[PDB]
Amino acid sequence: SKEKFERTKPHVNVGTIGHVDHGKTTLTAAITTVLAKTYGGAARAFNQIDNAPEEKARGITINTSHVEYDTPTRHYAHVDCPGHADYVKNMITGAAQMDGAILVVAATDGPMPQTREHILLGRQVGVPYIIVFLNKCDMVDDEELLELVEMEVRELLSQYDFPGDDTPIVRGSALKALEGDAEWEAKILELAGFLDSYIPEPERAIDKPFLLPIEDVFSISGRGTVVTGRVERGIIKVGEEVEIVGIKETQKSTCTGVEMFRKLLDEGRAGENVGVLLRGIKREEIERGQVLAKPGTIKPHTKFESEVYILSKDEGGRHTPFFKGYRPQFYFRTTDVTGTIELPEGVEMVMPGDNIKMVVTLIHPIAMDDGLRFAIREGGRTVGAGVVAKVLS
Amino acid sequence: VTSYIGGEGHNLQEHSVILIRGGRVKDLPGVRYHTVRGALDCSGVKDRKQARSKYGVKRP
Amino acid sequence: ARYLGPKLKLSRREGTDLFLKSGVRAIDTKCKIEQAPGQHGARKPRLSDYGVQLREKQKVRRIYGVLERQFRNYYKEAARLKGNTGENLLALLEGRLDNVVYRMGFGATRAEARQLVSHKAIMVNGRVVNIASYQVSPNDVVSIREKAKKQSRVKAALELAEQREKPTWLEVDAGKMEGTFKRKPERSDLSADINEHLIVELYSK
Amino acid sequence: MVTIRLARHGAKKRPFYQVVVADSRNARNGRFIERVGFFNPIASEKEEGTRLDLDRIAHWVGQGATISDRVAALIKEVNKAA
Amino acid sequence: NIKSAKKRAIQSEKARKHNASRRSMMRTFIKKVYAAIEAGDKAAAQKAFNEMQPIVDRQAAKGLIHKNKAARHKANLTAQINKLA
RNA sequence: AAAUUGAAGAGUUUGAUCAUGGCUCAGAUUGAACGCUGGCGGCAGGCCUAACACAUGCAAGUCGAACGGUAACAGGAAGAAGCUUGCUUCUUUGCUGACGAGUGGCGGACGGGUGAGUAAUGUCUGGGAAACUGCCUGAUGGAGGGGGAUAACUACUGGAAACGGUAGCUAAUACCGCAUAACGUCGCAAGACCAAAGAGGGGGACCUUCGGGCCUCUUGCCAUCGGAUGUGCCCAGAUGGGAUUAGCUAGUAGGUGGGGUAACGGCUCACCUAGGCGACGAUCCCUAGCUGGUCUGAGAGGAUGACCAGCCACACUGGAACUGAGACACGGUCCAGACUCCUACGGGAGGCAGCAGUGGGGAAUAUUGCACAAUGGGCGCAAGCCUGAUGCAGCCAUGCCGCGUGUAUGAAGAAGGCCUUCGGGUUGUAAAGUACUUUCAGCGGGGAGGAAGGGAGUAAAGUUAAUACCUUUGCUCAUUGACGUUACCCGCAGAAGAAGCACCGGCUAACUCCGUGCCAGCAGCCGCGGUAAUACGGAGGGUGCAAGCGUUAAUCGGAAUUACUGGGCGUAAAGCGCACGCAGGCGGUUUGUUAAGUCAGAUGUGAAAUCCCCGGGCUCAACCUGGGAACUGCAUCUGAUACUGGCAA
RNA sequence: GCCCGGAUAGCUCAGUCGGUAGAGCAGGGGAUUGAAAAUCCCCGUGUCCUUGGUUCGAUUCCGAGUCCGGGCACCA
Ligand SMILES: Nc1nc2c(ncn2[C@@H]2O[C@H](COP(=O)(O)OP(=O)(O)NP(=O)(O)O)[C@@H](O)[C@H]2O)c(=O)[nH]1
Ligand SMILES: [Mg+2]
Ligand SMILES: [Mg+2]
Ligand SMILES: [Mg+2]
Ligand SMILES: [Mg+2]
Ligand SMILES: [Mg+2]
Ligand SMILES: [Mg+2]
Ligand SMILES: [Mg+2]
Ligand SMILES: [Mg+2]
Ligand SMILES: [Mg+2]
Ligand SMILES: [Mg+2]
Ligand SMILES: [Mg+2]
Ligand SMILES: [Mg+2]
Ligand SMILES: [Mg+2]
Ligand SMILES: [Mg+2]
Ligand SMILES: [Mg+2]
Ligand SMILES: [Mg+2]
Ligand SMILES: [Mg+2]
Ligand SMILES: [Mg+2]
Ligand SMILES: [Mg+2]
Ligand SMILES: [Mg+2]
Ligand SMILES: [Mg+2]
Ligand SMILES: [Mg+2]
Ligand SMILES: [Mg+2]
Ligand SMILES: [Mg+2]
Ligand SMILES: [Mg+2]
Ligand SMILES: [Mg+2]
Ligand SMILES: [Mg+2]
Ligand SMILES: [Mg+2]
Ligand SMILES: [Mg+2]
Ligand SMILES: [Mg+2]
Ligand SMILES: [Mg+2]
Ligand SMILES: [Mg+2]
Ligand SMILES: [Mg+2]
Ligand SMILES: [Mg+2]
Ligand SMILES: [Mg+2]
Ligand SMILES: [Mg+2]
Ligand SMILES: [Mg+2]
Ligand SMILES: [Mg+2]
Ligand SMILES: [Mg+2]
Ligand SMILES: [Mg+2]
Ligand SMILES: [Mg+2]
Ligand SMILES: [Mg+2]
Ligand SMILES: [Mg+2]
Ligand SMILES: [Mg+2]
Ligand SMILES: [Mg+2]
Ligand SMILES: [Mg+2]
Ligand SMILES: [Mg+2]
Ligand SMILES: [Mg+2]
Ligand SMILES: [Mg+2]
Ligand SMILES: [Mg+2]
Ligand SMILES: [Mg+2]
Ligand SMILES: [Mg+2]
Ligand SMILES: [Mg+2]
Ligand SMILES: [Mg+2]
Ligand SMILES: [Mg+2]
Ligand SMILES: [Mg+2]
Ligand SMILES: [Mg+2]
Ligand SMILES: [Mg+2]
Ligand SMILES: [Mg+2]
Ligand SMILES: [Mg+2]
Ligand SMILES: [Mg+2]
Ligand SMILES: [Mg+2]
Ligand SMILES: [Mg+2]
Ligand SMILES: [Mg+2]
Ligand SMILES: [Mg+2]
Ligand SMILES: [Mg+2]
Ligand SMILES: [Mg+2]
Ligand SMILES: [Mg+2]
Ligand SMILES: [Mg+2]
Ligand SMILES: [Mg+2]
Ligand SMILES: [Mg+2]
Ligand SMILES: [Mg+2]
Ligand SMILES: [Mg+2]
Ligand SMILES: [Mg+2]
Ligand SMILES: [Mg+2]
Ligand SMILES: [Mg+2]
Ligand SMILES: [Mg+2]
Ligand SMILES: [Mg+2]
Ligand SMILES: [Mg+2]
Ligand SMILES: [Mg+2]
Ligand SMILES: [Mg+2]
Ligand SMILES: [Mg+2]
Ligand SMILES: [Mg+2]
Ligand SMILES: [Mg+2]
Ligand SMILES: [Mg+2]
Ligand SMILES: [Mg+2]
Ligand SMILES: [Mg+2]
Ligand SMILES: [Mg+2]
Ligand SMILES: [Mg+2]
Ligand SMILES: [Mg+2]
Ligand SMILES: [Mg+2]
Ligand SMILES: [Mg+2]
Ligand SMILES: [Mg+2]
Ligand SMILES: [Mg+2]
Ligand SMILES: [Mg+2]
Ligand SMILES: [Mg+2]
Ligand SMILES: [Mg+2]
Ligand SMILES: [Mg+2]
Ligand SMILES: [Mg+2]
Ligand SMILES: [Mg+2]
Ligand SMILES: [Mg+2]
Ligand SMILES: [Mg+2]
Ligand SMILES: [Mg+2]
Ligand SMILES: [Mg+2]
Ligand SMILES: [Mg+2]
Ligand SMILES: [Mg+2]
Ligand SMILES: [Mg+2]
Ligand SMILES: [Mg+2]
Ligand SMILES: [Mg+2]
Ligand SMILES: [Mg+2]
Ligand SMILES: [Mg+2]
Ligand SMILES: [Mg+2]
Ligand SMILES: [Mg+2]
Ligand SMILES: [Mg+2]
Ligand SMILES: [Mg+2]
Ligand SMILES: [Mg+2]
Ligand SMILES: [Mg+2]
Ligand SMILES: [Mg+2]
Ligand SMILES: [Mg+2]
Ligand SMILES: [Mg+2]
Ligand SMILES: [Mg+2]
Ligand SMILES: [Mg+2]
Ligand SMILES: [Mg+2]
Ligand SMILES: [Mg+2]
Ligand SMILES: [Mg+2]
Ligand SMILES: [Mg+2]
Ligand SMILES: [Mg+2]
Ligand SMILES: [Mg+2]
Ligand SMILES: [Mg+2]
Ligand SMILES: [Mg+2]
Ligand SMILES: [Mg+2]
Ligand SMILES: [Mg+2]
Ligand SMILES: [Mg+2]
Ligand SMILES: [Mg+2]
Ligand SMILES: [Mg+2]
Ligand SMILES: [Mg+2]
Ligand SMILES: [Mg+2]
Ligand SMILES: [Mg+2]
Ligand SMILES: [Mg+2]
Ligand SMILES: [Mg+2]
Ligand SMILES: [Mg+2]
Ligand SMILES: [Mg+2]
Ligand SMILES: [Mg+2]
Ligand SMILES: [Mg+2]
Ligand SMILES: [Mg+2]
């Protein structure tokens, strides 16, 4: 909080995806040290990508850590997702804001059960583009074995509905590029080139009014309570009226400073992760899931009609019917929420792999409008995608 | 202290943080306070129209 | 700030004619006056000692269009002023601009006079005044501004003032909409029906 | 050092200055020996505008008291023969 | 500290180096008189009194000592010389 | 001419009564909070609890007219070198203006903040001598002639930093002698002794050794005696609660002598005496800043001491002194401590009870805004720079006060609701409908008043050898607003954008119908509900307030329920079981005689604000404001002698 | 942000390792009374915290949640 962030180069939200203990967080650390050395950005280290007691005694990552590496063309903003099956909830918030992912499959183990689950969540939420990275390579010195894994990833993406063969696969060790090997340093400089070439300039919405889903809340010692997240649409000027909408009720507020990776800003534009400082609000009363909207634009609702597309055994979801009373998790912009289902008159049961509409009464009210996309989940797996039809409350 | 819970029906149980104002009940000997309906975890009375500042209920 | 409800309802509860909806026509005969305050209008009231005081206060309030906070402040001024506390209460009420504008005959009703004062029409001693509560001092000259002079509402309302008693304490030109407030109003000049003594009783306790 | 200076009373945007004989170390509005007239800049042409008791000024300025920049101007405003 | 007028710290420390020495000098010349007093006639004591008289008066004029301090160190000290001897 | 015009009761013990006596209510009021509902403006206010711990920026600097600096920086002048000979390179010049870093001056001790401590060291009222007092200001009269240092700057090192050391060197209003000194300082006096600093703006004449000297004039220094303003100290009375705290006390209480204090003093010592305080409450304990005031009251009183003003106290906790005119020093210093801190592990920091802001505590209380434009404050000849003092702005119905939320006509007495003896009533001129406004918001143009000054010039005065320079000035110039898309004025537009929430059994203004059946619930007091509830829940209808309304808490009132004004004690609560009796309270009657009480007068004071009355100024009000009265007092001074006291018969 | 416990008819508790849950204390219906209480004669009055899954069948076995309990961290 001192240096002013100069608005140059387009902003892009990137993040690593993949199996547990597969080189996902280590890739993030490899991208910093490579890009910082040659081009001349800020250095950083593997340290702080994940500190705490939880991510040291174990070694695993829980929190979605962020990184800011810069290149001549564009200014990237990383989102290193956790990895585990148990940490899928806080991952989806990191994955929703992420524009273009970096998948991490390993040459030794290959595509594992979570790799299938992570890419499954990427499609239904909103991950337009994806890039593969083989994160072991050196451990198995062979030409035939390493190339057989590349075939299975191309099959995985094409089976689950992506381009597959068009996606640029890259090979390279993360640990070898951490130190200073000339052949392996240049091979991850190549990944930065694939990030620029494949993923296009993202289409923002700098016209329709201000909205910002809160991914994680903070309490800065001195300044006040702060909320982070990607600005979904519109802009934010300093000293402007902002209404916080979502869970509990609704509160008036005013912005008193927006920032971008510990650097000041005047205008917080759309499609970029920013930390908004709020005036006269406590850490407890504001929570994760709520949205920073401009007053009057959006209203919180606890009941709505919605066209739900349930999945089958083949697509990956439920395989049995269910009657009114069923309570799955509904993942809107960031947070999840439970709700009872009231089916329409003339529909006795809901079979798997079927398009229908239904009334859903949620326990917590969330801010929503007509034409909002969500992904239903229940029992550590997906259920179905859909869209909102009508407001009731 | 003991505190009386006014209105018909309540959400109070086991714990739940509530607000207390003064006022005896004059019936339960020992009870000498009233819970404020509306404030904190104590919600408003369900389906009330007349006298709703007392009992913490919003407009219809 | 104002009543803005059923105005002729107030007259039936009080019983007597309050001049709220006096207007163009002289006598109403269109409400069942006296014997229908509300649903239970046929109910003959017992009417206690506090009742008759409250009914008398509420009558004088509703005639002059004043609320309890502002009305109780007139009593506090009336007590500190010299002479009789009762005579001062009503003398200060009659000194209001919205009341003087009604008594001059630039308004069929007192609410119409209040709106006329409030909407930049009324002017006194070469100065525009918006406040209905404006205490009109002795020896003044209230009048209408030339932009809003001889508009449709004032000319018809001035013809009504010929049927009225017309006060002695003030004088009106009638040609060029120009008034002249001269002296302070006496007790015996006006009303001779609304009791002051009972209103002094209500506030003293 | 005793000094003759303005006190600044009155409402917001509606100043009224009590010219007053006070010690330099004491605050503007605070302690004084004795007040010696007043000044009103938002008075305009009417009955009253500025008053300044010149008899008490001889007791202080004659002995040893400075006159502030604004109060020195009001002694010129009231005049000796104008 | 958070000010540029900490010159006063180094100035007041520089003052008392000087200020203590001249004070120390004075109170030794006064001790010189009390040393002479006790076992001595009016001769050795009054010689020491004539030596300190200019020193105490001078330091009184410079603001180290106050003029009444100086006044007493003549007044009470002459009363020792006059009464005893 | 005006300064108080002021004193209300009701419900509730009983089958009923009168009394006693509690309980509760009607009114004012607030730093408020909460619930529901929320349009504007104006003026006020807005961490009472954790004196909790707090990142970040900022709250005190200033002068070149003190001084070295021929300057860290940016720029003119004598001269230089390149070459597009005025375009460029560039050494000298206090020399262009100034000023980073110093050295000295004055400031930092004021201005802000907070009530932790403090029951008397404090505060209040009235007195009183033993005092000091920078800046300001009266008077007198000096200010003469010398020295040795010393930073900065180098030079050379140490250190991670903070911050040093060693070798030079140099300036002064820094520093110290010396002469020089009195109505000054000690003394019986004779005597002795004690100081100073120089600057800046101009010059004819003549010395030029050019650094000019000498006239010049503002300025500054220094000694005394003074005023002014502060401040230190002393006394008297007053200033909370507890006796289920009755004895405390050894520098304790006084003396003589010495030291010390700006000043007197057990302030502090040495010895001497054996006190001193105490029932008119010492000591100990708990609580507490104090006052002007505030709220309340018919007044006496009771409660309270947020905001404005005076005094005190305190500054991370516990100490000490240094500097100074002033501090035992909020943003100095030094230790010690607890807690945060950074490091190269040697050592360093740090102090929001300045302004914003954070966490935490809490029922609860705000912007890391703009500005020195004004008003004071700081230095300075000034210009100016500095200023979270102040002035604005934000926020919050937290209050007090203003205007809103339309205004006439309108019978088919419509619909719909609600009630009914189904005839009709009522909601209700309510609505719709037609006639009109256009305040306030919403827009577009106009646009004050807060601004006095400071300059650039001038004109005569001042001042002098001078038609100079400063002191005073009157005339001509161009300017100075954070507020600010200002106050206020017009210009459209269309009723358009603008109403709730208590209550409705008695006290207490206002009633029916359904639902429920001592259940669910209400309740300020009495009390409502057991299948026909006016008290519960809803509905309609009413009543009372209205951008507020209620609930909660808090103080006084009513409470003559701590009674001094103004109560009681046979039986309601209440005469010790009965005596004696010291201290204490009270005391027959006549003369004196003082004057303590008492009374009368007079003078000083009782800060300003506040209150009160007559005015005045904001469109009105709240708000601001002139004068008056008042400040019920306390002191002294002069009388009066009836009464009370003292004192003699 | 993530670990862990807690919930069984109106209240206080038993019961389970898939075999379909009970006890007291309440409550209700009739008799009686103005209504009760006792007296007399009859009744569990249940979303096993919610929801899905493994199965013929889940309180019971395995996920996902609810609100609440206590625990460890992150400083745009
Ligand atoms: N030899 C080698 N080892 C690697 C390479 N990349 C990753 N690893 C190893 O893989 C392990 C996983 O590290 P990390 O990336 O933090 O795990 P993750 O992929 O983020 N998943 P999660 O954080 O949920 O546990 C580490 O022990 C690391 O040494 C590589 O290129 N070469
Ligand atoms: Mg493995
Ligand atoms: Mg990881
Ligand atoms: Mg492991
Ligand atoms: Mg493996
Ligand atoms: Mg109002
Ligand atoms: Mg109407
Ligand atoms: Mg009264
Ligand atoms: Mg003071
Ligand atoms: Mg003026
Ligand atoms: Mg230091
Ligand atoms: Mg010595
Ligand atoms: Mg000195
Ligand atoms: Mg009574
Ligand atoms: Mg009574
Ligand atoms: Mg009875
Ligand atoms: Mg009786
Ligand atoms: Mg509030
Ligand atoms: Mg509230
Ligand atoms: Mg204001
Ligand atoms: Mg406090
Ligand atoms: Mg403390
Ligand atoms: Mg503290
Ligand atoms: Mg820091
Ligand atoms: Mg700090
Ligand atoms: Mg500053
Ligand atoms: Mg100079
Ligand atoms: Mg010079
Ligand atoms: Mg101070
Ligand atoms: Mg102070
Ligand atoms: Mg203050
Ligand atoms: Mg105080
Ligand atoms: Mg005194
Ligand atoms: Mg000084
Ligand atoms: Mg002086
Ligand atoms: Mg002189
Ligand atoms: Mg010399
Ligand atoms: Mg020498
Ligand atoms: Mg030397
Ligand atoms: Mg030397
Ligand atoms: Mg020298
Ligand atoms: Mg000196
Ligand atoms: Mg000296
Ligand atoms: Mg000599
Ligand atoms: Mg000499
Ligand atoms: Mg003498
Ligand atoms: Mg002599
Ligand atoms: Mg002599
Ligand atoms: Mg000298
Ligand atoms: Mg010179
Ligand atoms: Mg010359
Ligand atoms: Mg002179
Ligand atoms: Mg001088
Ligand atoms: Mg001077
Ligand atoms: Mg001087
Ligand atoms: Mg002197
Ligand atoms: Mg003097
Ligand atoms: Mg002194
Ligand atoms: Mg003493
Ligand atoms: Mg009063
Ligand atoms: Mg009163
Ligand atoms: Mg009374
Ligand atoms: Mg008190
Ligand atoms: Mg305070
Ligand atoms: Mg304030
Ligand atoms: Mg203040
Ligand atoms: Mg004092
Ligand atoms: Mg004192
Ligand atoms: Mg102290
Ligand atoms: Mg102090
Ligand atoms: Mg402090
Ligand atoms: Mg300190
Ligand atoms: Mg200290
Ligand atoms: Mg201390
Ligand atoms: Mg000293
Ligand atoms: Mg000095
Ligand atoms: Mg001192
Ligand atoms: Mg200080
Ligand atoms: Mg501080
Ligand atoms: Mg330290
Ligand atoms: Mg603060
Ligand atoms: Mg806070
Ligand atoms: Mg400026
Ligand atoms: Mg100033
Ligand atoms: Mg000065
Ligand atoms: Mg001068
Ligand atoms: Mg000038
Ligand atoms: Mg100035
Ligand atoms: Mg400033
Ligand atoms: Mg301030
Ligand atoms: Mg308001
Ligand atoms: Mg408001
Ligand atoms: Mg509120
Ligand atoms: Mg209509
Ligand atoms: Mg019109
Ligand atoms: Mg307007
Ligand atoms: Mg406009
Ligand atoms: Mg001017
Ligand atoms: Mg102006
Ligand atoms: Mg001028
Ligand atoms: Mg100025
Ligand atoms: Mg000039
Ligand atoms: Mg000039
Ligand atoms: Mg001139
Ligand atoms: Mg303008
Ligand atoms: Mg207008
Ligand atoms: Mg119009
Ligand atoms: Mg119209
Ligand atoms: Mg029109
Ligand atoms: Mg309306
Ligand atoms: Mg029952
Ligand atoms: Mg009945
Ligand atoms: Mg009924
Ligand atoms: Mg009711
Ligand atoms: Mg109603
Ligand atoms: Mg209220
Ligand atoms: Mg009371
Ligand atoms: Mg009383
Ligand atoms: Mg009595
Ligand atoms: Mg009695
Ligand atoms: Mg008895
Ligand atoms: Mg008895
Ligand atoms: Mg007895
Ligand atoms: Mg007896
Ligand atoms: Mg007794
Ligand atoms: Mg006796
Ligand atoms: Mg006697
Ligand atoms: Mg007698
Ligand atoms: Mg007698
Ligand atoms: Mg006599
Ligand atoms: Mg006497
Ligand atoms: Mg007396
Ligand atoms: Mg007297
Ligand atoms: Mg006064
Ligand atoms: Mg007045
Ligand atoms: Mg006026
Ligand atoms: Mg007026
Ligand atoms: Mg006032
Ligand atoms: Mg006044
Ligand atoms: Mg006055
Ligand atoms: Mg007087
Ligand atoms: Mg006689
Ligand atoms: Mg006699
Ligand atoms: Mg006698
Ligand atoms: Mg039964
Ligand atoms: Mg039973």
Side-chain angles (χ1 to χ4, degrees), chain D residues 26-72:
Chain D
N26 296 329
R28 182 189 66 182
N29 284 65
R31 191 137 107 75
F32 56 83
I33 298 90
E34 56 108 315
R35 68 180 286 283
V36 54
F38 66 89
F39 171 61
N40 193 2
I42 55 157
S44 201
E45 206 289 310
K46 66 184 181 77
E47 293 173 10
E48 193 127 56
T50 315
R51 190 193 295 158
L52 186 62
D53 188 42
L54 297 163
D55 294 22
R56 293 169 179 183
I57 299 293
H59 178 245
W60 289 119
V61 174
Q63 296 282 250
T66 56
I67 309 95
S68 63
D69 62 330
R70 187 53 164 282
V71 177

Side-chain angles (χ1 to χ4, degrees), chain A residues 79-92:
Chain A
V79 182
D80 177 48
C81 294
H84 288 205
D86 281 300
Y87 316 148
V88 295
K89 270 137 280 199
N90 66 288
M91 174 181 74
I92 288 156

Side-chain angles (χ1 to χ4, degrees), chain A residues 210-225:
Chain A
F210 166 55
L211 187 64
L212 163 54
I214 303 163
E215 75 171 320
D216 205 307
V217 178
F218 291 104
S219 183
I220 295 175
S221 184
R223 311 293 288 107
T225 197

Side-chain angles (χ1 to χ4, degrees), chain A residues 154-213:
Chain A
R154 286 156 168 268
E155 286 171 34
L156 258 193
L157 295 160
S158 189
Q159 183 180 333
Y160 278 121
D161 268 297
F162 264 108
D165 66 308
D166 295 42
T167 59
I169 299 169
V170 189
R171 52 171 71 266
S173 177
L175 291 184
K176 292 281 178 284
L178 197 126
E179 31 165 306
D181 297 42
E183 73 191 329
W184 301 110
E185 284 271 340
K187 219 171 280 279
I188 295 172
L189 282 171
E190 205 176 276
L191 183 65
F194 283 119
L195 267 166
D196 295 313
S197 191
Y198 186 73
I199 302 163
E201 289 191 321
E203 303 186 63
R204 311 313 197 179
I206 311 169
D207 182 41
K208 66 177 171 272
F210 166 55
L211 187 64
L212 163 54

